[PDB]
Amino acid sequence: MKQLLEAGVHFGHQTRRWNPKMKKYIFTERNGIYIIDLQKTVKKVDEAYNFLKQVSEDGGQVLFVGTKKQAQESVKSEAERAGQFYINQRWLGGLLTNYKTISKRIKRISEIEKMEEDGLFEVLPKKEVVELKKEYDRLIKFLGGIRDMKSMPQALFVVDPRKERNAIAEARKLNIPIVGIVDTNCDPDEIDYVIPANDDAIRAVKLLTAKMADAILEGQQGVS
């Protein structure tokens, strides 16, 4: 669970062009923005605390997709706290449905390291080595933070989903469920696995992504 009184600056909107499928979740209108109702926020948090726990006991991973500034460091620091994978910087266009040709680029972060022990340092000329170093820095940069993605992940977690439109577009087209902190203009109303909360600060991302980082933790310990 969580608490309404834990939410200090964990409520509000960026109101200017809200979506009116988020008319049910507002509390009132205070100071320009639509502040968001916290009786149903904590209830959808504990419903997601059941849902991330109960489905993941047979080889179950989460994908922590947070690409937004002041939402990437929460996933970056809390995914390997949880022990899972994530994508903090540059979600790819095509990483879930396009896995048959990004299996080449989930392996070529390991390929380079299958050349460092058995001959890389200037046995080739100088215009291959620093270029392959730039390929390593870009494939630890633009890939995300995933390394052991063996299959398609059976769960997924998007953080700021109004900007990550192709993150929901590959999870909807592989019938894997989404968990999103739905801000204003998020089109999920049809799926009851969202979090009606606020992503505008480090703490407002952080305290509602940390519970879904530790939510699966309680899915490991007790039934495996």
Binding site: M152, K173, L174, N175
Partner: protein, 165 residues
Amino acid sequence: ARREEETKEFEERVVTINRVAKVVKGGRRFRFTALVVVGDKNGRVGFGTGKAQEVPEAIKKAVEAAKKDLVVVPRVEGTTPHTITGRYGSGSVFMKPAAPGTGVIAGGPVRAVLELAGITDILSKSLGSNTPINMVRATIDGLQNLKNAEDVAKLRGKTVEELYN
């Protein structure tokens, strides 16, 4: 729309192969598009269109891109439960149910969908337009928008022996 699906041994069927051009400086790069349905004859038909530089790679790509688009097709002893008119792209298809022993009376693309959907007993008429990707999309837009008996009588609260079959 969802994941790749390989339940039964499916049966491919080529609806059309067209040679489509792209004019460049020089001659023209022309490809082969190949609208191919699949379906395993107990329900579960599904179409797909793929294009390539050569013809059997185009129908192989259309089979491997057709198996993600499998609709359910609820049916009753080889017959659709009711009459419909499936619409896409001004290319509509009338699909009337039938008795056993009357054949798939359907045209060119809609027979190639319906006779390997499991449905052997139907009366179609292709209204509108005779383009094969629109008639195939309109007969699968027919077949996915289709009511079973138990699904309607669990949708509303009046179940078995409430309405009339």
